[PDB]
Curated annotation (Swiss-Prot), chains A, B:
Post-translational modification: Phosphorylation of Ser-3 converts phosphorylase B (unphosphorylated) to phosphorylase A.
The name this protein goes by in its record: Glycogen phosphorylase, muscle form
Originating species: Oryctolagus cuniculus
InterPro entries in UniProt: Glycg_phsphrylas, Glyco_trans_35, Pyridoxal_P_attach_site
Oligomeric and partner information: Homodimer. Homotetramer; to form the enzymatically active phosphorylase A.
GO molecular function, one term: nucleotide binding
Notes on how activity is controlled: Allosterically regulated through the non-covalent binding of metabolites, being activated by AMP and inhibited by ATP, ADP, and glucose-6-phosphate. The activity is also controlled by post-translational modifications including phosphorylation.
Binding positions for AMP per the UniProt entry: 31, 64, 290-295
Acetylation in keyword set: yes
Keyword Transferase found: yes
Lineage, broadest ranks: Eukaryota, Metazoa, Chordata, Craniata, Vertebrata
Reported function: Allosteric enzyme that catalyzes the rate-limiting step in glycogen catabolism, the phosphorolytic cleavage of glycogen to produce glucose-1-phosphate, and plays a central role in maintaining cellular and organismal glucose homeostasis.
Substrates-to-products reaction catalysed: [(1->4)-alpha-D-glucosyl](n) + phosphate = [(1->4)-alpha-D-glucosyl](n-1) + alpha-D-glucose 1-phosphate
Modified residues (N6-(pyridoxal phosphate)lysine): 652
Length: 808, 808
């Protein structure tokens, strides 16, 4: 059908159809007369999977022969989403399969919707891991993704009475055709026990043992025949056992890989979570070393191994690597430490205090006794270095210690990471500067060379070609298909900004996406949106710093203004807000309720008509993002300046033809810088403005007294205007806004509303709106994860990326 | 290589080899240079599996079209063993695969040993289910085996210090290629709740829900292209959910199908066990009814459905069927009951009191409230019938009640079964007569027509062709291969009893089996048996009624006699005793220890040389039985008369060329009757003898005082002769033997020892021993499960078996 979607081919198509039938018959054991749609999905999934195996085996074969430096990406999260379509795209089988399935009388799109999302992530951090795997494979790097195979990923969100209800994400129920169990690589992981000191050194003994079984999932590069591996560990109990109970208690050990903690940028010092962090770390390292010894001095270890820590979650890799080298390989501490620092690198993802991992000493003391001793030793030698560089600065020592004193002694994992890594990077220029000027100022002054920046990016394969084939096509029609793996080329579209034909096509693709999505809402959610209105969407995890509330205030303002002048003209808008709230985050759940409550009032007001609709996008996840983003006109990125490290959703919207309204926060700064501030809708306080507001003191009351429209909104919330049967339902919201708002929602209200008016004014001029859109798309090249990965490779891992196709 | 093993074939072999490679490449994702032996086993397993699918789909297709009466075999146990070789045999692919694997440079036997046993059974009862499935498929019956898919089957037994150590049987760890998950047939099962009475009748409400997911395993008939199904249910928690714990608590619901209770002929009133019994029953019935409505009056239900209860374990099918018909389909009680009785049949497996299921009323009251009411109602109407037939016999009423009074009110499930079934059968003639004369005398007098006998049998496919191809061949060489599916033809061998060539061949096959097994013991168990000695083996679950102890007394006698006259000649013997002891059955575990203790003394006595060896066969199971049985010369079947309902191991030994020494118990009676008492080594008390011994009173001391040799043995056990470091280790054994032996071990000692001497005398005459052997094999035809199943079909289910081959 469309060019960028691959060639069909007589032989190719008849080859797929026959294999589809082989699998339906032999693999699923069924015939066309009893086959269920799920059966069809599986037949196709196995057929496509077969085209990966040859390349997967030869790629892993290639690395064994050439023996290149290996990149190990450790993360407790891999927000993969669906993989059927992504695999077809990277293999160029999309049109062929579409045709073959067509001839077999089946709609492929219907079959793809049957696939369960691999929701092994919470949000930004886990999606970055997923995009990185794709880019690493597309750039020919010998990379391995390592994490945990959770039986249950992020929970499925259902709204009842306007409230969020959590449901277990049993994604493995019908089976996963993409994974391959490798029982022969099972390894033991130790917990508890005690440390024994002998003549030969320390000995960790009397430990409880848990087995780690790996499941490999293929990761195809884009049209280069490279297939890397993502290895996920699963917890199994040893077989070595009144009798019934002993057998049933095996579930205790296997609960380690049972469920993903649903926290987004928030620390929970639970034991189960620590066990998970050590489990993935211990099993991965043994696999790493094993693979290494098959190439005994570890002096060459750093030249053959690079270990990237995605946040502090896998920070135990540092003391674990030391333990093995010192306790097992018998290297001397200093040599061991040199090796450790040279192979490990750390990526920081946030600056908010509640997200920092600080594990109680008593917990590490019981669970990982030897690791605690190693951490103390690391701390000792590290503070000796600080003391020597900054003589007499006793305060600096307390601040830099990996150990935090107080009622409860804790270990600061972020400090552990900085000390044990040769590189520490932020995820956006502004975030990286803040790390050097605030949070890690002391460390930066001690070792300025370790700190770097690596602005995040997204993969143009899944986030453009896959989710917006219509836009990918009209772009390919003018500049070719090379940009798909070299997004910078998108700049060439800059000379089509005045092209009438292009303007019409870009505007038409968007319109089509909106129509398709507008229908989607009625089908599986029976709604009533007007596809001619402006699609105003804010989708991301629900959090106070994200300020979904500021968005809510604007929506209530629009409503009040309409009611004030019913017969005045206003640009119609469909406001969509979606995202999951972590269970137990009360405020976050109150916000979802408030949003649905507003929709309940606004959506049923005869006077408003279809000029304003408020929709809460239920169960937001990767597969839903692939749908709503291509259909958006306005991207809401309004976090208080200095709180959103980088953000990646913002890049998704820019690449897909939506305009951005946001603060100078995270990557927003670099995006506006690339497109030109005039092509961005920037508003609100900048970082410094937040700073001198705190020094002076934030008094929300001041804004309430000076802004009539704001005052009215607050009075409506308090009086029960949005909760008739429960007048004080939102007393907590108002209370927080008026007396304890850490994120200064009122401070940016006026500027936000005004900027929103300029957005509406521009939407009234279709041609100019679209021309600004073209300028955003044309400059979104920098935000491709290919660029990001190429920088990590050259500036951190010390390996050269290659686009050379591997033999077919 | 051998005739009965199928034809190779040019096309056939090159077709297997290529498919073997397809699977190794595409299914296991590997190449010959990294493939592990397990990988090879799986490639072959998937290849063979592919040859089943066509027939499996057409067989199930056939039944749908013809719509024959369906047989549902309910059992909580299916002792399947390995299925790779069995499948090849029934498909006649054994030689072809052997050749194809040979050409690929692989030893098939080595690959078969990699397969895990499906140990979803304890012993006799579960193996009978397995043999029945094979026969039902071989006789073209539209039969379905229904049970539970236990994550952990019978535990693996390991001996340490002479003691039994239990290990979890994690048989699904590497995966099961034979099963097929059918998520679309998932059904809900209810527990707890309460009964609500309305205008429309009773309503079971506020129940906890557990889902039942089926996994189908193919069951191939012998060379007839029929492939039946064994559907095993797995417990899953519903998805409808502080947050972490709720997710982790899902394991509570899923623990229902986690492990098989390891009890052999012993009742454990545990809640988990009851839940298992209802779980398999409720899910199976819904499946049965669903399939029925697709052929609404249930008057025809009994003509289209037969439900066989393997013991009382699935007895809840009776009140469950009533519940559905009355509470859901709204039929009137009497009609419902007529239907129930006509579709259900019950098979009794034992008469020992400790095996009878008596569930506490309070348990059924909490877990299955409505079922308790239905049982009470059934009991009421049933006793009204007894009262009418036996006016004034108040005692008879108490005895027959399904409800047993006392400190704790219980429900007698066996009484429930008799009342709700149109047929009740014993498993051996003598066992069935005992049911009518004792245990169920009252029921028999009330309804003599319900009671029947169906002597057990074993499948000649697995128990001859598969485990003893050498014997199968030399027999086929003279009478053809028709006997494999018509064992009666084995009688034709009766006219070869004087044939010199046959005598030499039969004796040679045995010798070969003994050599192969004698080596096996050294390889994986590093032992030292003499293959020229008589193989004396007793393999079965360890139990006091089985009297492994009587065997022990004989072994100690032989030893003491040798030590008395060291230079006297005695026929050398290798005594093998194997079997698992249920955990918590103290006495059973003491017996295993005693056996190993004897071996420790006997096996290291220089004076004994290799004239006497005592070996304890570790981890006895189906796959081990297939090895030791073909190699045995003497089969020990010495249970106290009247305790072993039937036995099936006895039939296995007879079919494989071993002579039998045993009591007139269970099927032993019918076997000796078929071969002729002169060709059997019968000894000990008969049922009546046990009876007048009890009436008089059993005084073990009397035997101890009158038998010098017996006295010496007891003194040795007490003095610590077999436990030097622990003098009173066996004080409990002696105590039980002397004061509380329910099984009268001493009563049969003298006769047992003497009979054992006649066995030795016969072994000294090779030619005559072998001629007697031929007479046993030649008459073992009656014990084929094909005969057994044909009788169930005609006399109980009302369906005609057929040997007609189904189109290929
Ligand atoms: O594995 C090492 C030890 O681990 C564990 O210790 C951890 C603590 O439990 C944890 O609380 C935290 O320590 C913090 C501490 O609690 C806070 O009080 C604070 O401490 C600062 C203090 O307030 C400042 O005064 C200053 O200390 C200076 C000190 O006053 C000054 O005298 C000098 O110190 C020199 C010593 O005087 C001199 O004897 C010599 O010390 C040798 C030592 O003899 C030798 O054995 C070896 O150290 C051994 C040690 O002896 C063992 O006891 C064992 O220690 C472990 C603890 O038991 C654990 O509880 O093993 C050690 C091996 O490393 O080597 C020493 C020299 O390296 O030289 C000293 C010169 O440095 O100068 C210091 C300047 O630092 O600073 C203190 C730190 O800011 O803050 C602490 C950090 O948060 O973390 C501990 C692990 O780091
Ligand atoms: O669902 C039915 C009931 O279920 C539950 O009851 C069970 C008991 O809990 C459990 O213990 C066991 O019962 C045993 C009992 O505990 C023992 O004591 C013993 O009882 C025997 C007794 O010792 C003997 O004397 C003899 O009883 C005779 C009786 O003495 C004599 O009078 C005559 O009985 C006639 C009645 O007199 C007459 O009124 C009439 O009864 C009607 C009844 O009116 C009508 O409602 C209906 O029965 C209802 C009943 O009324 C409800 O209470 C309800 O009963 C349930 C219990 O509540 C549960 O606890 O529902 C019933 C619906 O079936 O129909 C009755 C007639 O069928 O006619 C009677 C003529 O039969 O004769 C009897 C002769 O039997 O024998 C007793 C039994 O041997 O042994 C009991 C069995 O172990 O089991 C109970 C369920 O079976
Ligand atoms: C891209 C993405 C995110 C990250 O969004 P931000 O707005 O940067 O927080 C979160 N969830 C999903 C499903 C995503 O696709
Ligand atoms: C045949 C068999 C049994 C039954 O043996 P009996 O001696 O009748 O109790 C038990 N276990 C296995 C493994 C069997 O093969």
């Amino acid at each position: 059908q469309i060019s960028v979607r691959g060639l069909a081919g007589v032989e190719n198509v008849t080859e797929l159809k026959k294999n589809f039938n082989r699998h339906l018959h032999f693999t699923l054991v069924k015939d066309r007369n009893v086959a269920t749609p799920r059966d069809y999905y599986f037949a196709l999934a196995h057929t496509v999977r077969d085209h990966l195996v040859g390349r997967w085996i030869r790629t892993q074969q290639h690395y064994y022969e050439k023996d290149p430096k290996r990149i190990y990406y450790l993360s407790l999260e891999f927000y993969m989403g669906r993989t059927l379509q992504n695999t077809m795209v990277n293999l160029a089988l999309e049109n062929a399969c579409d045709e073959a399935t067509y001839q077999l009388g089946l709609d492929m799109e219907e079959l793809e919707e049957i696939e369960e999302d691999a929701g092994l992530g919470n949000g930004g951090l886990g999606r970055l891991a997923a995009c990185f795997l794709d880019s690493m494979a597309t750039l020919g790097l010998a990379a391995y993704g390592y994490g945990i195979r959770y039986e249950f990923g992020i929970f499925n969100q259902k709204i009842c009475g306007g409230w969020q209800m959590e449901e277990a994400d049993d994604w493995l129920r019908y089976g996963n055709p993409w994974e391959k169990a490798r029982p022969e690589f099972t390894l033991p992981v130790h917990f508890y026990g005690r440390v024994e000191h002998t003549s030969q050194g320390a000995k960790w003994v009397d430990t409880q043992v848990v087995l780690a079984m790996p499941y490999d999932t293929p990761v195809p590069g884009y049209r280069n025949n490279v297939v890397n591996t993502m290895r996920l560990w699963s917890a199994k109990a040893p077989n070595d056992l009144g009798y019934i109970q002993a057998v049933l208690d095996r579930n205790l050990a296997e609960n380690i890989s049972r469920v993903l903690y649903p926290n987004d940028n928030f620390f929970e010092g639970k034991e189960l979570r620590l066990k998970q962090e050590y489990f993935v770390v211990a099993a991965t390292l043994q696999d790493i070393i094993r693979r290494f010894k098959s190439s005994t001095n570890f002096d060459a270890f750093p030249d053959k191994v690079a270990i990237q820590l995605n946040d502090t979650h896998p920070s135990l890799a540092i003391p674990e690597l030391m333990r093995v080298l010192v306790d097992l390989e018998r290297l001397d501490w200093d040599k061991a430490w040199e090796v450790t620092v040279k192979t490990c690198a750390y990526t920081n993802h946030t600056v908010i205090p509640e997200a920092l991992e600080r594990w109680p000493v008593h917990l590490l003391e019981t669970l990982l006794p030897r690791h605690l001793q190693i951490i103390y030793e690391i701390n000792q030698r590290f503070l000796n270095r600080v003391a020597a560089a900054f003589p007499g600065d006793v305060d600096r020592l307390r601040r830099m210690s990996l150990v935090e004193e107080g009622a409860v002694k804790r270990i600061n994992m972020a400090h552990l990471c900085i000390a044990g890594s040769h590189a520490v990077n932020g995820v956006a220029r502004i975030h990286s500067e803040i790390l050097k000027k605030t949070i890690f100022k002391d460390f930066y002054e001690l070792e300025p060379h370790k700190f770097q920046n690596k602005t995040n990016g997204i993969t143009p394969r899944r986030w453009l070609v896959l989710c917006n084939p219509g836009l990918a096509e009209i772009i390919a029609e003018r500049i070719g298909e090379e940009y798909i793996s070299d997004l910078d080329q998108l700049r060439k579209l800059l000379s089509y900004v005045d092209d009438e034909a292009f303007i019409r096509d870009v505007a038409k693709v968007k319109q089509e996406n909106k129509l398709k999505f507008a229908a989607y809402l009625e089908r599986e959610y029976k709604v009533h949106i007007n596809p001619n209105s402006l699609f105003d969407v804010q989708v991301k995890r629900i959090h106070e710093y994200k300020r979904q509330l500021l968005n809510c205030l604007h929506v209530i303002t629009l409503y009040n203004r309409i009611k004030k002048e019913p017969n005045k003209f206003v640009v119609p808008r469909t406001v969509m807000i979606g995202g999951k709230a972590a269970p137990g985050y009360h405020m976050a759940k109150m916000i979802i309720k408030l949003i649905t409550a507003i929709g309940d009032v606004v959506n049923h007001d005869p006077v408003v008509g279809d000029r304003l609709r408020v929709i809460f996008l239920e169960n937001y996840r990767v597969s839903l993002a692939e749908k709503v983003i291509p259909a958006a006109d306005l991207s809401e990125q309004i976090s208080t300046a200095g709180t959103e490290a980088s953000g990646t959703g913002n890049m998704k919207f820019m690449l897909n033809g939506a305009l951005t309204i946001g603060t100078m926060d995270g990557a927003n700064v670099e995006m506006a810088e690339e497109a030109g501030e005039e092509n961005f809708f920037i508003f609100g306080m900048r970082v410094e403005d937040v700073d001198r507001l705190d020094q002076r003191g934030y008094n929300a009351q001041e804004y309430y007294d000076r802004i009539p429209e704001l005052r009215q909104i607050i009075e409506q919330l308090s009086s029960g205007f949005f909760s008739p049967k429960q007048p004080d339902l939102f007393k907590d919201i108002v209370n927080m806004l008026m007396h304890h708002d850490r994120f200064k929602v009122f401070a940016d209200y006026e500027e936000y509303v005004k900027c929103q008016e300029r957005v509406s004014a521009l939407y009234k001029n279709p041609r100019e709106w679209t021309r600004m859109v073209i300028r955003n798309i044309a400059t979104s090249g920098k935000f491709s994860s290919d660029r990001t990965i190429a920088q990590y490779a050259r500036e951190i891992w010390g390996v050269e990326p290659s686009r050379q196709r591997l033999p077919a």
